[PDB]
């Protein structure tokens, strides 16, 4: 039995940790219980082995490390220190993108997006776009529809930031391959997003 | 089993957090581990009751409630937003003063002393000094040498700030009770500071 108590955690980090724990626990076929008391998030997991619990701790560390470095950047420190913190974000986003969890891949996307928005057209912005594309490739492999909807949205940010780049070409392939998988779903909302995705690749 | 994730806290808040979890753990004789993890504190407690776990949660939530409000005080000094943060610091310090632990009481003394420093002579300082005396009274009842030393220093702070007040008379009563227990300590340094405190009680 395992329990995680999140105190003074930002909502972005909390929800990504909620989805990461719920994902890793379904892998071992275990139920998860969440409750929010006085701004404290209690995550209780039952019958979880050490291997999956250590995987929860690694993903939770990286998400909090990204949030800790984003807090320094948003404090407008020295530009030299801010650059050092953006490299910390990209380092944790790289490992978050090397994990099978959907929430970890979604965390690597949102982490690398803030680096692109912080310094557009920089060497780190290009490395951040590599992280966004690395996460979109693993996110398109996953079967869930929500993962496919984030794989297209993430790849669309690569073609928006660097149109005509080498990364944008692969991002368009990811959008096409993910939209074809979305066409398999009978739900009209999945078919709608697949058509707008196909129309975006047709427009470019 | 239980992992506490604490983010966006200073070094002083983290040190008070570690000692508080260690003290609540001895009530059940459990095992606790800490990790500093660059920007967020990780606390793992094994085989602890859910009540004790939720006592750690509310105590750590009060500590970060003080740390977050202090951050506002040190950034917009003199604003009406600072006056609101000082009332939040006192509201959390009052609840920490009711908790009968050395770390929880030290956190209430340091917090309320920060309100005395920011708003001298105001009604907030008077409410803060009452919390300092409430925590000093609980510290004197604790059977620990360092807790008795802190009760003397906290109540001596009250007589230094507003002397000849109704609170200064109550402070001298607390100083006397703590010094009477300090003289029973075999520690020579405790014997020395107990006489210095009892000498200050004869005066005023």
Author numbering:
A (entry chain D), B (entry chain A): 1 to 204
Please give me the paper's original passages concerning this structure.
We set out to design sets of interacting protein pairs for constructing reconfigurable assemblies. We instead sought to use implicit negative design by introducing three properties that collectively make self associated states unlikely to have low free energy: First, in contrast to the flexible coiled coils and helical hairpins in previous designs, we aimed for well folded individual protomers stabilized by substantial hydrophobic cores; this property limits the formation of slowly-exchanging homo-oligomers. Second, we constructed interfaces in which each protomer has a mixed alpha-beta topology and contributes one exposed beta strand to the interface, giving rise to a continuous beta sheet across the heterodimer interface. Our implicit negative design principles enable the de novo design of heterodimer pairs for which the individual protomers are stable in solution and readily form their target heterodimeric complexes upon mixing, unlike previously designed assemblies.
We determined the crystal structures of two class one designs, LHD29 (2.2 Å) and LHD29A53/B53 (2.6 Å) in which both protomers are fused to DHR53. As for unfused LHD29, the interface of LHD29A53/B53 resembles the designed model; at the fusion junction and repeat protein regions, deviations are slightly larger. To further disfavor unwanted homodimeric interactions we rigidly fused designed helical repeat proteins (DHRs) to terminal helices. Since these DHRs have different shapes, they also serve to diversify building block shapes for subsequent higher order assembly design. We used architecture-aware rigid helical fusion to generate two bivalent connector proteins from the crystal-verified fusions of LHD29 and LD101 that allow assembly of a perfectly closed C4-symmetric hetero-oligomeric two-component ring.
